[PDB]
């Protein structure tokens, strides 16, 4: 029997998950770091997909390959400056990070931050 022979295409769905089906979204753990040498060398990287890359990029922006005092977090980090003292707070959210930063550092103020 002579059948119809044509490839089957259609209209693909541009949707990813839904509300009808789509479990409450667990956080997307991104990896980041803020490399801050007391020298004033600051660098930050966030929303990375690999801890190694994040760390490398943090060191990259800091400037030193071996930039230490690097804060590595998969949360949000907030760096406060207090008269040449640099303190980095950490919280899942920037609100919690600023809260932690100001918990650990008072007197000064948060001027740098980066959230994953």
Curated annotation (Swiss-Prot):
Disulfide bonds, paired cysteine numbers: none
Top-level taxon in the UniProt lineage: Bacteria
Keywords tagged on the record: Signal
Regions annotated as coiled coil: none
Inducing factors: A member of the dormancy regulon. Induced in response to reduced oxygen tension (hypoxia), low levels of nitric oxide (NO) and carbon monoxide (CO). It is hoped that this regulon will give insight into the latent, or dormant phase of infection.
Tagged with keyword Cytoplasm: no
Family as reported in the entry's similarity comment: To M.tuberculosis Rv1269c.
Protein name: Uncharacterized protein Rv1813c
Originating organism: Mycobacterium tuberculosis (strain ATCC 25618 / H37Rv)
Residues of the full protein shown: 28 to 143 of 143
């Amino acid at each position: 029997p002579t059948v119809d022979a044509h490839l089957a295409n259609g209209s693909m769905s541009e949707v990813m998950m839904s509300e009808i089906a789509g479990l409450p979204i667990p956080p997307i753990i991104h990896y980041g770091a803020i490399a801050y040498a007391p020298s004033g060398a600051s660098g930050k990287a966030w929303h990375q997909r690999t801890p190694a890359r994040a760390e490398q990029v943090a060191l990259e922006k800091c400037g030193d390959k071996t930039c230490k005092v690097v804060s590595r977090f998969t949360r949000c980090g907030a760096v406060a400056y207090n008269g040449s003292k640099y303190q980095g707070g950490t919280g899942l959210t920037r609100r919690a990070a600023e809260d932690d930063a100001v918990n650990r550092l008072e007197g000064g103020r948060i001027v740098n931050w980066a959230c994953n």
